[PDB]
């Protein structure tokens, strides 16, 4: 897949022999005030090797 | 002239398929193209034999 996270943050190769596991958590990762404890990279000089 | 055959692919050229489609289906398309080319080569080899 080609996108934003898959391009410069975490790229997956053609062969993986596996998959991902995801779930929704709107309580532990969210606080009453602003929760700005996570950062991600979108600018890069070139592509990211997997 | 058998090299200019689509063999079920979008085009007879391989770089366009490599740089256009996603690798999960591009690998299948290249596999089909190269196995068609191998079948044609085997037919030519049998005729030469």
Curated annotation (Swiss-Prot), chain B:
Function, as annotated, reads: Subunit of the fusion protein that is processed upon entry into the host cell. Mediates fusion of the virion and cellular membranes by functioning as a class I viral fusion protein. Contains a viral fusion peptide that is unmasked after S2 cleavage. This cleavage can occur at the cell membrane by host TMPRSS2 or during endocytosis by host CSTL. In either case, this triggers an extensive and irreversible conformational change that leads to fusion of the viral envelope with the cellular cytoplasmic membrane, releasing viral genomic RNA into the host cell cytoplasm.
Top-level division of the source organism's lineage: Viruses
Q: What is this protein called?
A: Spike protein S2'
Summarize which stretch of the complete protein this chain spans.
964 to 1012 of 1273
Which residue windows are coiled coil? 1-30
What is the organism of origin for this protein? Severe acute respiratory syndrome coronavirus 2 (2019-nCoV)
